[PDB]
Design a protein around this ligand. Structure first.
Ligand SMILES: Cc1noc(C)c1-c1ccc(C(=O)N2[C@@H](c3ccccc3Cl)SC[C@H]2C(=O)O)cc1
Ligand SMILES: Cc1nc(NC(=N)N)sc1-c1cccc(NC(=O)c2ccc(F)cc2)c1
Lengths: 55, 266, 230, 340, 224
């Protein structure tokens, strides 16, 4: 159990060493991904009934 | 359009208006429940009952306009034999479907294991088809033998000698049997639920009273019309109160969704 | 999978005969069954068909009202009652299995073969014998009366290869997709009417007669049969 | 022991400051001038009917035409969403199934549940009937989510507080992922199939590494059991649904919360989360018989998709984004699709 | 509009659909019972009479097939998988009277009987089991005869005011379990005392199952 706590401790510092990017940069990437793939989304922009497989 | 006829028009208008939308809602709910997985035979019997009631309601305007013409000298000619046939066939089909629903209710509380084992919609379809046949085919053969020789109101002494046996048969072998089985099954169900020491008076009453009300509605709606057959045979004449009798008989077509669908939600 | 048939033999005209097809090694009750016969020194032509849970017993026009096909799922056996065996009826009969769902491979396995010695879509192949050598690519082309491209997008063509002394083997189904175990060198293609099949690296085992099926209309007419010569 | 406890507490505070430092501005603040999607209304194009009990899982095939649904009836039906055809009906060994999957190659389907066994079924076989390719045993708890990597690698997350990676050929757990303290309810596989997250009952989501075998990042913020999870289409984010009636979108690189999709009129917990093809619509299956569509960049509901009687337990958008099925406890799937 | 292959595909779907209906009208014939016992209290004596996670015990009585799912094997959280059992005919709860004085091995602070009461507390008024009945079973009454003589019932409940006689000591334990039942309108929890040899345990379950069948049958008809 004491060693088990050491493991939790060991798992904690290895996540701390992870290089974290800024949220603003991370936020922009998600928004840019939607903007680049907006035209290919049949739910965001409904497709014409001719090309719609479900009718 | 004199007194009693005016009261008949008022009653017909109110029953049609009160029973139509309830009938559509009940029909939609019963169809939806049929679409759900594992339907019960009583669900199909309820669906058939509401379909027969709806078909009766659709034939009400012909009756109301006929009564508006002093319940006589109907303006159309070849539609009397269709509208009256449909109305009476629907009445008797509703009677037989009520008997079938009573049988299902008795089975669900007196033979629970057997009802659960044989809870397959095929039996419900078979029972609905049997009721539909025993009503519509009887009316069809009657109208056929009528064609092998207003709106069925005034006849002649020659015609009565054939009409009266038909009414006697319809009252004795086509209504008494459903009435007898309904009375027996509902009496047994009420006694069983009153001798069931599981659910207290807070909810068993809600079923005992519902069964009592259903039996009373049956005997009050389909009673006078059918005993009119025996009365007419006894006095060898067409009873004059057949109009109020069929009004009472059709009252069940609107009261049925109140007792079968609008009781759970209310 | 193994379809073994029995009941063939010499029969006098006007007699009767029963053919039994024994199905072993696969779910017989889930597979639709076809009957295909082949006249000696000739091609193939459809005979009959029975569906899993028999509800579709489509026959061929030349045998309609005279031949009856029945299946026995519990014992895994397919029947074919022979009635009024005419002179033309002499041929070798093949047992064919087929399953129908999205992405299935109908006409997958063919029986060993039993011999008998007593409006419709047309499918014609321009060539009947193509002298070929191993190492070169040869294209086998068929023809159709009307376009086989159904509105679903499927083009109902089935290719088969009949090596000498052997049952036909499915190579390309729906004109686009390979069958199970077929070498990847085969590659079918074509439009609704433009129609061809290509083989890349021919070997000694690729010789035989190539037949093309149409499956849009159930008469199921074969092709002329292009024979490859070593 | 206290020395380790303090080192732990100190390390936990250190990562909190690191997450706080990197949070220059919230996701809602930056994505404020973008045009909202408006009102997304969807209609039930198809109603795949034939189940006889509740539904807890469904998975679209890679072709976006075949989906497999699991139900308490014991049947694992592979539908054909284009024509409502039941291609197969596999009778499960145990009727208690809480997960199902479709292999990317389309040859295998897996099921699992209270039996703690993940069963692999071989769809394409010579015999013509679906057979149990191999029963994967080794979990001592109910299995909640299984997802295929390849035809011979499947990741299963169960009630063992652990997620495991299996080799279907051998039948053993090559890599076992440990670190969760509560029941693991769902997992999501990255598009690159190199990382996968898992939603546990301790209100914590951990990003694992399939090749290495240890948790890479741990995400907190929820207040109840995480009932569902799904990756962003680009693989750099994921969304967690919980009984707290809140959907939350985390970021792998930022290693912190980005937005929360909450509403004061919603109290029931989320049962399934699935993004759209563009990663803008966040389909979520709530327990109030709704499927509220959340704009992942605006946190504003854009649809209700109310067509179910019982809970919307499972849902999934196709690979081409052309439809979104919603399995539900009323034994009916509905292939929703927004008309023009 | 349908191709030759497309028409045959529909026939496959129709054949598949019939099998589900045939297997859907057969599963409803069976009765599903959830043996949700306490911590190693019973679940062994009763299962002998009526014939790595979920284990299903299938037994038949009076032309009725019962499926019994002993879910106590799993050590995971009960709440996360107990919605699967919403819809069982009854819950065969099992409590051992011999644990009225024994203390939990893993805790050594909480009485074993009090552990059973805690689990019954949440289960009886669970949001999924408001309509499903509960067939409470009190087994190991043979050892309860001797154990109550050595130690009074005050070990578990100091509020108890009575002698060590079996007639009133057992009744208090029954009355204790009646208390936690909050939904006293759509669920009555049946109680029964069983030794290790009586064969009436199956009959009592069937009698309590029938009273649930009647209620289910009435709901279909329209009443209740
Ligand atoms: C036979 C025959 N031949 O001439 C005549 C006249 C009859 C004859 C006609 C009617 C009846 C008769 O009482 N009926 C039948 C009926 C009534 C109205 C419309 C259609 C039909 Cl079928 S069914 C219901 C019953 C009823 O009224 O409720 C009896 C005998
Ligand atoms: C065999 C069966 N199993 C059912 N269902 C269930 N056991 N759950 S129904 C039913 C059945 C099948 C055919 C006919 C009838 N009998 C009537 O319909 C009837 C109605 C009114 C009347 F006055 C006399 C007879 C009933």
């Amino acid at each position: 159990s004491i060693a088990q706590a050491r493991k939790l401790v060991e798992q904690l510092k290895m996540e701390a060493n992870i290089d974290r990017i800024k949220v603003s940069k991370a936020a922009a990437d998600l928004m840019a991904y939607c903007e680049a793939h907006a035209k290919e989304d049949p739910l965001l922009t409904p497709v014409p009934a001719s090309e719609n497989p479900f009718r | 359009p004199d007194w009693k006829s005016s009261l008949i028009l008022m009653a017909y208008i109110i029953i049609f208006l009160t029973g139509l939308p309830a009938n559509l809602l009940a029909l939609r709910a019963f169809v939806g429940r049929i679409r759900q997985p594992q339907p019960a035979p009583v669900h199909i019997l309820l669906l058939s009952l509401t379909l027969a009631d709806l078909l009766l309601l659709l034939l009400l305007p012909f009756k109301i306009i006929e009564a508006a013409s002093n319940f006589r000298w109907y303006l159309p000619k070849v539609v009397c034999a269709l509208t009256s046939f449909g109305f009476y066939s629907s009445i008797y089909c509703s009677t037989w479907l009520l008997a079938g629903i009573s049988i299902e209710r008795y089975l669900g509380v007196a033979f629970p294991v057997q009802y659960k084992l044989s809870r397959r919609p095929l039996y419900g379809v078979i029972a609905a088809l049997v009721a539909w046949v025993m009503s519509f085919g009887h009316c069809t053969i009657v109208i056929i033998v009528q064609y092998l020789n207003t709106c069925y109101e005034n006849f002649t002494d020659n015609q009565l000698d054939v009409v009266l046996p038909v009414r006697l048969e319809l009252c004795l072998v086509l209504f008494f049997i459903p009435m007898a089985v309904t009375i027996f099954c509902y009496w047994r169900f009420v006694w069983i639920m009153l001798s069931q020491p599981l659910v207290g008076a807070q909810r068993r009453r809600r079923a005992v009273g519902l069964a009592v009300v259903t039996l009373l509605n049956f005997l009050v709606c389909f009673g006078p019309y059918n005993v009119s057959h025996l009365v007419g045979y006894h006095q060898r004449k067409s009873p004059w109160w057949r109009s109020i009798a069929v009004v009472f008989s059709s009252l069940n077509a609107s009261l049925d969704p109140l007792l079968f669908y609008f009781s759970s939600s209310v | 999978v193994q379809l073994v048939e029995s009941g063939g033999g010499l029969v006098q005209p006007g007699g009767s005969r029963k053919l039994s097809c024994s199905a072993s090694g696969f779910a017989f009750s889930s597979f639709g069954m076809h009957w295909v016969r082949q006249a000696p020194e000739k091609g193939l032509e459809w005979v009959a068909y029975i569906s899993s849970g028999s509800g579709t017993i489509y026959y061929a026009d030349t045998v309609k009202g005279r031949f009856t096909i029945s299946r026995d799922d519990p014992k895994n056996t397919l029947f074919l009652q022979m009635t009024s065996l005419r002179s033309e009826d002499t041929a070798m009969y093949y047992c064919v299995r087929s399953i129908y769902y999205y992405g299935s491979s109908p006409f997958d396995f063919w029986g060993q073969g039993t011999t008998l010695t007593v409006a419709d879509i047309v499918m014609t192949q321009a060539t009947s014998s193509v002298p070929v050598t191993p190492g070169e690519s040869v294209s086998i082309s068929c023809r159709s009366s009307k376009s086989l491209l159904h509105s679903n997008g499927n083009t109902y063509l089935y290719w088969f290869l009949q090596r000498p002394g052997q049952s036909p083997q499915l190579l390309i189904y729906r004109m686009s997709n390979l069958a199970s175990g077929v070498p990847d060198r085969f590659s079918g293609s074509g439009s609704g009417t433009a129609f061809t099949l290509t083989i890349s690296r021919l070997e000694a085992e690729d010789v035989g007669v190539y037949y093309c099926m149409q499956h849009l209309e159930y008469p199921l007419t074969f092709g002329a049969g292009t024979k490859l010569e070593l | 022991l206290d020395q380790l406890r303090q080192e732990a507490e100190q390390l936990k505070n250190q990562i909190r400051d690191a997450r706080k430092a990197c949070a220059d501005a919230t996701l809602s603040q930056i994505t404020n001038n973008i045009d909202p999607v408006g009102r997304i209304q969807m209609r039930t194009r198809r109603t795949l009917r034939g189940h006889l009990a509740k539904i807890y899982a469904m998975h679209w095939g890679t072709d976006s035409r075949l989906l497999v649904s699991a139900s308490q009836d014991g049947k694992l039906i592979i539908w054909d969403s284009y024509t409502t055809n039941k291609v197969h009906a596999i009778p499960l060994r145990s009727s208690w199934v809480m997960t199902c999957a479709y292999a990317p190659s389309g040859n295998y389907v897996a099921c699992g549940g209270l039996d703690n066994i993940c069963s692999i079924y071989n769809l394409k076989t010579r015999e013509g009937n679906v057979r149990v390719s191999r029963e994967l045993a080794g979990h001592t708890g109910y299995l909640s989510c299984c997802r295929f990597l390849d035809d011979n690698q499947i990741v299963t997350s169960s009630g063992d507080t652990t997620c495991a990676l299996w080799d279907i050929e051998t039948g053993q757990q090559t890599t076992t992922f440990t670190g969760h303290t509560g029941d693991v309810m769902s997992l999501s596989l990255a598009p690159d199939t190199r990382l996968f997250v898992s939603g546990a009952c301790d209100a914590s989501a951990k990003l694992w590494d399939v090749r290495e075998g240890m948790c890479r990042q741990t995400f907190t913020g929820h207040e109840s059991d995480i009932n569902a999870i799904c990756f962003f289409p680009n693989g750099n984010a994921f969304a967690t649904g919980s009984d707290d009636a809140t959907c939350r979108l985390f970021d792998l690189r930022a290693d912190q919360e980005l937005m929360t999709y909450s509403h004061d009129n919603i109290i029931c917990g989320i049962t399934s989360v699935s993004f759209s093809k563009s990663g803008r619509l966040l389909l979520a299956g709530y327990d109030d018989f709704n499927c509220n569509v959340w704009d992942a960049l605006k946190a504003d509901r854009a649809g209700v998709l109310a067509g179910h009687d019982n809970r919307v337990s499972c849902l999934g958008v196709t690979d081409d984004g052309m439809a979104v099925a919603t399995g539900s406890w009323d034994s009916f799937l509905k292939i929703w699709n927004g008309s023009s | 509009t349908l191709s030759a292959e497309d028409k045959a595909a529909v026939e496959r779907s129709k054949m598949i659909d019939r099998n589900l209906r045939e297997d859907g009208e057969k599963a409803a014939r069976e009765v599903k019972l959830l043996l949700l016992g306490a911590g190693e209290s019973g679940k062994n004596t009763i299962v002998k009479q009526m014939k790595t996670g979920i284990v299903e015990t299938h037994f038949t009585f009076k032309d009725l097939h019962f499926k019994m799912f002993d879910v106590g094997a799993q050590r995971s959280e009960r709440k996360k998988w107990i919605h699967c059992f919403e819809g069982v005919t009854a819950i065969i709860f099992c409590v051992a009277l011999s644990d009225y004085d024994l203390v939990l091995a893993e805790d050594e602070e909480m009485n074993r009987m009090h552990a059973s009461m805690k689990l019954f507390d949440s289960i009886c008024n669970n949001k999924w089991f408001t309509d499903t009945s509960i067939i409470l079973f009190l087994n190991k009454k043979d050892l309860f005869e001797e154990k109550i003589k050595k130690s009074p019932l005050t070990i578990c409940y100091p509020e108890y005011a009575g002698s060590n006689t079996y007639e009133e000591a057992a009744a208090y334990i029954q009355c204790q379990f009646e208390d936690l039942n909050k939904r006293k309108d759509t669920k009555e929890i049946y109680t029964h005392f069983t030794c290790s040899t009586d064969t009436k345990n199956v009959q009592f379950v069937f009698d309590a199952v029938t009273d649930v069948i009647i209620k289910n049958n009435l709901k279909d008809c329209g009443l209740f």
